[PDB]
Every structure is written in C-alpha cells, then in structure tokens.
Amino acid sequence: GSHSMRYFFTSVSRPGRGEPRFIAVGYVDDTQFVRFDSDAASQRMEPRAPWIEQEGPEYWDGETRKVKAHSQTHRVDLGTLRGYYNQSEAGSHTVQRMYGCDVGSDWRFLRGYHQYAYDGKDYIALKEDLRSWTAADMAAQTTKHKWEAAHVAEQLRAYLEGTCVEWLRRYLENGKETLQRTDAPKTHMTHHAVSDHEATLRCWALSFYPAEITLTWQRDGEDQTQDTELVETRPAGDGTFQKWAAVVVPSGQEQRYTCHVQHEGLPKPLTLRWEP
C-alpha cells in the first residue's frame, strides 16, 4: 500500500573549532538512498542505494548545490537561536529538520510534513493543512511570523504535493526490485529457564522488510502484555530488520502461550508455540 520519502538533517555547533557538523540523509520507506556529511572529503551528495546510481551528473550536481544551501541555513539558524534563547557561545547545540511526503497504494498524495527541533525539542512544525504553523514558544513564534511574510508555507506545499510525490514514484519504479519487495519474517521460538518456578519464551522475527511489524503474546487465546518484553526493531546490516518478544511464564505451562506475528508479507498472520 503506502510509501514515504523522508529527508533528515542534523547540524551541531562546535564552540571550539570552526563550522558545525552537518549530516543529511534521505530515505524512501525504510531504505536510505542518499547522504551528505560536511566532514567528508568528497563535499558531495553521495549514493547509498544501488538504484540511485543511475541518475545523471546534473542530478548529483543539483542535489549537492541544495544540501550545501540547507547546511548554510542551519549554520545561521544556530546563531539565530542562541540569540532568541539568549545562550552563550559556550556549549554545543543541535538543530534538526525533517520533511517528506506519503502516498497511498494508488500512489496519490496522502500527507506532508516539515518540522524543526532545537536541542531535541519540537521547535516549529507545518500543520497537516500545509497552510499554517505550530509554534512552541516566543522564539518559534518569531520564526513563524518571518515565514508567514516570506511565503514559506506556499514554497513547501508546492514541493510536498508535487515534486516530492513525482520523485517518490520515479524512485519506486527504478529499483522496483528492492523497494516494492516484501520479505516476510523468518520466525522461531526459544526457551530459557529463568528460575525453578518460571521460564522465558522468546519469539523471533528475522530478515524482514519493511520494518513495520507486530509481535503479540497470548495466554489461552487472550491478549497479554503483563510480564512481556519487546525490543526496539533493529537493522540487520543488509537491508532487513529483526525483532523479538519475550514473556515469562510459570514452568510447565508453556503450551498455553502463543506468539502472533503480523507483517505486510504475511497477509494471514503466523502463530507460534513452544514445541517440546
């Protein structure tokens, strides 16, 4: 069904020694396809997925011009925010930006986003209407007023509804074979005796894509979240993902518990049991 394209940007000041670290990264769905790092020798936007290598020199030149511009605005934003919040030059701060669009299974525009954060706290965000801004505090309200007069929302709407989508489609058609694949998780269960009176059952999902997944445990067919543990979905280093879910149970009662796994590649979900 749905797909997304997402660009993320991070600048970090370095009070001591020169200009800020700038790192930018682009994704479609859960696949990184592009990157820039102000500290790398190349000083160029670099490919990070095979299917983007096809694109021609004009493309990489254009993208490079623009990431550099983005980093410049961040460079000045750091100074601007030190002013707004009245902070010293001592101490390192962080500006972050993300933007992108979503499309549905029909590949029509579904939703757009554009947000900033200062030191890990929401600063300003475009609202779902793409006309209006959410501004955290006096500082962010200053920015909001600046942007209202400079017609930034219009600039963003035009990108998010048009360009963002047209290029998302283009990407999904080149390297169709990586981005429109679904790899159903390979699954299995393990058992470990915790103590004399109990045991943990751990339910595994491996080698799957995309990352969205749901692992659920039941007892006698009733949803259980008491005495369960989930781990954050994590990358195997090869384009796929991993997750496990564990529950601790009285020993001798393993048969009463089942693990249910839901994923795009499993239209009918799996259930697993401890085979003694």
Binding site: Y7, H70, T73, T80, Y116, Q155
Partner: peptide, 9 residues
Amino acid sequence: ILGKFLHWL
C-alpha cells in the same frame, strides 16, 4: 529529491 529551500529560523 530535495526541496529548493532557502529558509531561515
């Protein structure tokens, strides 16, 4: 593709 964005906070 990146937005053609010259925006300052």
